[PDB]
């Protein structure tokens, strides 16, 4: 009994993963492992942007029936909603300007302005660990506004997932003048393992199917074939 249409929301601010190109159109690799998956299932899928912060609302409200947005897998996550196996994954970094001093740790970013998305685990992450110790953290509706607060010199410095700020804005032109500062933040509790399609805990065939639909394009070199498209480095992990 999986829905002969299948509701997918994604939040298409978060380039190479899920954006818009010039006339509208969803692109990015979620949406083509979305596609891909919703073909071998063999149901239709209808595409759904929201910002960010409300998709598990709207996962959970009906309004939508799956969510492929780079939602990491956490064990808070879980309490809620259910995955299916790893998409890919996804570590986190910040970025600041080019020669800057900064480093992920309070001592370097005590007083600076840090940008992170709404809804994220990289806001749970800086709420609980540098905005308590006041470095001034600011949330906001979508990526893209961070990346221009961030070249308007509003931030000093942003947090999200490392693949989408390299391949999303480092490697841009608006990029230019800046670069990854420090190494990747690793923290088990706050970033989960990898990114899955979100799902209601009771959609357990809809579950089946995605995982199911995964393993046969990963099996048949698809997977590869797609991320190729995309990257030269094994975004799959481990
Ligand atoms: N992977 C992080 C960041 C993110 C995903 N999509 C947009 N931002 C999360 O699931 O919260």
Redesign the pocket.
């Known amino acids: 009994a999986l829905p002969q249409t299948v509701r997918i929301g994604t939040?298409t601010?978060?380039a190479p993963?899920?954006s818009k190109d010039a006339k509208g159109e969803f692109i990015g690799f979620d949406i083509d492992l979305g596609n891909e998956m919703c073909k071998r299932m063999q149901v239709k899928c209808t595409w759904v942007a929201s910002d960010?912060d409300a998709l598990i609302p709207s996962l959970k409200a009906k309004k939508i029936d799956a969510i492929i947005?780079?939602?990491?897998i956490?064990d808070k996550?879980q309490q809620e909603i259910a995955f299916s196996d790893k998409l890919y994954a996804?570590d986190?970094r910040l970025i600041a300007a080019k020669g800057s001093p900064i480093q992920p740790t309070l001592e370097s970013l005590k007083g600076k302005h840090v940008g992170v998305?709404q809804?994220?685990?990289?806001?749970?992450y800086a709420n609980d660990n540098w905005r308590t110790k006041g470095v001034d953290v600011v949330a906001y509706a979508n990526?893209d506004l961070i990346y221009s607060d961030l070249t308007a010199g509003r931030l000093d410095a942003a947090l999200?997932?490392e693949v989408?700020a390299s391949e999303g804005f480092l490697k841009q032109p608006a990029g230019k003048e800046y670069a990854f500062a420090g190494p990747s933040v690793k923290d088990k509790k706050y970033?989960?393992d990898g990114?899955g399609v979100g799902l209601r805990k009771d959609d357990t065939e809809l579950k089946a199917a995605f995982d199911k639909a995964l393993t046969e394009l990963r099996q048949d070199g698809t997977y590869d074939k797609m991320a190729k498209k995309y990257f030269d480095f094994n975004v799959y992990g481990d």
């Open positions: 939040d601010t978060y993963f899920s960010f947005s780079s939602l990491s956490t996550r996804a986190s998305l809804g994220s685990t990289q806001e749970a990526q999200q997932d989408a970033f989960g990114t």
